[PDB]
């Protein structure tokens, strides 16, 4: 995967130049937003749980999908879906703190697709669950903090639609 | 079911199947007509177990059916009985094929985890089939009722 | 472990697909929160 | 592409031999059929419309597919999905005529899978559309054509899958 | 894989349905057929090594492929053509006892066609093969278990072609 | 084929087959149980077929089977009755097709290339090939003999 | 939306935005505020302007809420009203654009031939915007009114 | 069935049945077996024929279906859905009784009666038994179309 | 039978089930049964192997031939004791009701030793074929069917 | 092995065809056999507390529950447990069999070695063997006892 801080070094690398002043102020600026984010990724972490809960309260379950014929309909599918769900939540906080969307397409935005269409898994629903663990997240944060959340979260939702 | 369960043993080996496991399944093709007896009596009686079972269930955990409580109210009620109704339904299917397999892949695999997520008491859910299983055997005749325990059993088993 | 002996523990999408699609997906793909039309003149037809 | 007719000439062809009476037979069986075949194909291209319509409402319409982020979601995606069906039907009724799937595997099966893979279509929808469509074809064909379009129609979901 | 009383079972399972006397009807079919299909799997069985010889006999050998430049030249090839046909009985006997063709889709048919053409041995001669097995087998299994029999031998020929 | 031609123009406009198109076949249908028979019965005399044939034409053509012509000798000459052999192969597999197509790709696209590379004169195959049809004609009935008439006649323009 | 429009022309042509081009440029970023503030009136009256203009539409057609009528029952009804909610959407994208392009990727191509697959009619549908339009006008201010006409107009005659 | 009226005849005349009455018996059981395939025709179609039926007299009719109508609503749309179902089957039993009567006692006998009291109004009945006819002869044949059309016919000379 | 139940459950790591107790049950019981029929083939037995090894070789002249293995006094008496032997473990297998008896004792490196001795393989496997008629006649026909499948698993077998 | 078995390998070895005197032996099984099933049906309904009685009897409320005995700590405690269970089970089969030879084959191969390594204390273990026996055999009642004692104290020997 690639940080901020890797991002900007990297840059440099190719070029072969030393890091220099304006280098210095780009990796400065991720400095002052990193505590917000650390802070951020604590309360993710405690309420996890909650926030998937919540989520899918929103969105997937007392619906059609959780009922007879639907995709989270039996016990080792409705387990295999919250535990999706935890994965997206895992991945964003990853990204938040990394302060790069790299990471999600290097591990969950590729081939997610086709694995998704194979197992018949409905990636609009999927989107749908993605977006409301997004707004649950949002409160949590708070303000500052939701503005860097969302945009991963987006990201993740974009990639599968 | 007992005779995927053959098949895919056999496959495994990449032989024919053997004599001992032709066997078995011919003693279950036998004792299918039984067993699609019991299956009948208990989807018959369904609603009735169903009723009696949640009953018993309430009685025994007050506090399930208790503002605190997730069963309490009347929506979350129906779910907590509909709950009882699918593990019925899946041990006639377990009855029939006479293996828990089907059991187990609809009911018992993640069940845990979906369960924590909604935040049930694993163990009142466990009493639930318990007290099923108690009105099952009532109505049926007491071979029936022992082939019926054993579904039952393993429900009970899983679920902890 | 040294007891066991090996196993397929995982395969591809595209295996997964050689296996399971003939004969595609069985279902509608339901969504949560959908207006269908799906079943409601089967249940007419058991009513009547 | 090939037919039944000249099936049976290019193998005695390769094989360099003069036709006989085993391959006659089976050129007399294919003549037998084909007044029935005929008889079907008319059917069909008749009722091709309402065969889609039929069939889209049976699993692709009124689905995750049709909602926002879904695959057939928004006017152009919707027609172009109604196309493919259209396209699966004109082929399978060639080959129901001809009495061989080659002309499948030349002209829809070759690249197909590919192609959708790198679009996103999901191909396991795709393949039960296929499948509503043969079900809604047997009823109109009347059961001894049916037998002969079905074959036609497996082929399609074999091959996509 | 899938056997007919867990089709049945799995049928109903997405409906939510609780088993009917429809159901169980199909399910009481399957259980008079049972008592035929076991004896017809162990005949097989027996004569497994017979029935591959004869079939060869009529379709394989004394023929352009065991001739030089044939596809079964070379005893390496020829092994390989009797070890794939000892495959399709052995697989077409765990349908019969299944009383379902999906272990035939899962484990034979999947891929057959691809491997096939990249390899070079030809559809048509497998298929004849495979035809002349079911003769072979028809004569030995008897009348009542014959036409079980056939059913799956010819789903396997479909699959191939 | 018959049918084989009707497909590939529909697919051409991307249209399903045309009544007109669909009547063709059902004709063809019917017509191929005669088409069978017709076709069996040259493969009976094929081999008188050829033998008189090759006679006609060197009858007709001394100069091929002569010290500087290409027919000359015994291996050559086995080679012209060969090839007056396939033809009529190719000629049978096109009754029983309804169209000249499969007789066209193995038999008559590059034939003019091949045997020019041979050195083999063009015109005396197309003579061969006429008196194969000469003989033809007379085991066939006049009816029969029309309709194996066309596809001998489409072979001679073609050379 | 307007950049993309005169972005693209620059691009075929091989050259740098043209001084119009860039002052059309400066126009639309002016008249963005004024364009975000009609679409957000728009959006907060959407859920009326749908219900107003559905019973304007089924008075004006009994028959599409007939029991031969595509749109009759609950379920085809409430389908029926989504689709007006879907091109209401359609048409805020297209003010805040200031192009008709977002709209006619989203809901004219290929409109016809699924609305023909469907059954329903489209010149059904082409009302039930007049009627969204209409509500839409009462609502907004003369000149605000004008310039979401453009797009509820361009939208009926796509239909 | 034809039988019974001959034998209700010769009954009342206290004689034996008359040769040209043993006739028409001859003749109808010849006739029946045919009969028998158009009534099992119809009742495989049977549900169909109802859907469809029904949703043509609902287009002809919209009031029966509108506030105002008795038919409005889901319970009364059953209701008048299943009326139609008993008139199909009573057809059905006309057809191989090889006469009206079966029909006549069932259905069209007070029949006034009742749906005055009900408040349906007849002629809408009527419409549904002709729409019914209409889908019916579709899928028969020509030559059994005809011969289930009589049933259809007299079914709707009886309602008006 | 019982063998093979116990081993099923310790590879699951469980008791018996009740369903496969009831299998037991019904095992016990058809033992006796079972023993008949295995003392009705041993009575006959000395007949049986006679007649198995006369239609033998007339199926196969070759075998008892100056080149065949089974020529001469010496090579055909060892042949009819093969026989014997063979006829001896299916008796085993019918009163054990299981294969395993049968399989140990004759069908693990069975190619491996006639291969050493020279003996066909399928003369062998046409004289249990042999057998096996000869047995069916005497057998009742419900016995017949049983004794058949332990014939039937030797002629897969070899 | 098994009872059966036993007496086939016997009459194998000796190369002798079944005799009514080893028909005898067999039938003499088959009789004990209903009992022996009974037996274990009880054993595997009670076997849970078949082990917390004998754990009580012995095991608890000791040294070596107490910290710095061989079964203090939960995994201990539970490891202990599970063999428990394992000889249970074990005597069962053997029961049903009819034969000791299972737990010489399973069980007592190799366990005095083990235990030694891991310092379980074989006297202990031996101890609860007994407990469970006596345990057992008032559940299976007198008849059934006999032949399970047999099997227990075969274990405790072997350990
Ligand atoms: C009743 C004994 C207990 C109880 C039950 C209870 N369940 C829910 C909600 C759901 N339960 C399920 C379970 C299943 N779905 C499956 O696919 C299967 C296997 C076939 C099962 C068993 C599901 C999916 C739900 C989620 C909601 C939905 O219907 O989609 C609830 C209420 C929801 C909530 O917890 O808020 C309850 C109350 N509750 C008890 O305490 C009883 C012990
Ligand atoms: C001769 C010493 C022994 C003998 C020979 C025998 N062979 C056949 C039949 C076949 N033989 C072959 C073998 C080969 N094919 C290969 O590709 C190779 C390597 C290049 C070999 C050696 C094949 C393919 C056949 C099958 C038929 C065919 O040729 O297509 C037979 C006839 C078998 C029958 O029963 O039909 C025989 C008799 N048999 C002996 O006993 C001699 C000791
Ligand atoms: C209402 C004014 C008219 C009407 C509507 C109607 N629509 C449907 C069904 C669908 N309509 C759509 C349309 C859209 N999907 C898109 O992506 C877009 C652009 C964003 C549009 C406008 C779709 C996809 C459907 C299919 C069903 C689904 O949602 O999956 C119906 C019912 C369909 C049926 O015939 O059963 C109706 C009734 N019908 C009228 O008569 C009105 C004039
Ligand atoms: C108290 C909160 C609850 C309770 C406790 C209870 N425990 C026992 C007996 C034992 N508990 C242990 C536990 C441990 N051994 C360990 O090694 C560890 C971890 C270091 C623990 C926690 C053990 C071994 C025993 C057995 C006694 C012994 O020392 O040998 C009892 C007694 C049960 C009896 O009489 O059989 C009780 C009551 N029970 C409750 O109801 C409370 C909720």
Known sequence: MQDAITAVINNYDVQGKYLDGAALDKLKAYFTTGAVRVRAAAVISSNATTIIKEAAAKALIYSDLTRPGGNMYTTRRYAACIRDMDYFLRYATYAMLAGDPSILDERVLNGLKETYNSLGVPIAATVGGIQAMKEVVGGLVGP???????????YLSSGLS | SVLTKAIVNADAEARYLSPGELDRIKSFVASGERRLRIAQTLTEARERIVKQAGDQLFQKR???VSPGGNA???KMTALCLRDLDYYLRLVTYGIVAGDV???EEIGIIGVKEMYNSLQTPIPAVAEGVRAMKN?????????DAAEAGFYFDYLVGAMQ | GEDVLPYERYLTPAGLSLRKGRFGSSDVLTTPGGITPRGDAARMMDKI
């Open chain 1, 144 to 154: 500052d903090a939701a503005k860097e959340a969302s945009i991963y979260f987006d």
């Open chain 2, 62 to 64: 007050p506090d399930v």
């Open chain 2, 72 to 74: 309490y109210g009347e």
């Open chain 2, 101 to 103: 397999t089907p059991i």
């Open chain 2, 135 to 143: 009105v099952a055997t009532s109505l049926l005749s007491g071979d």
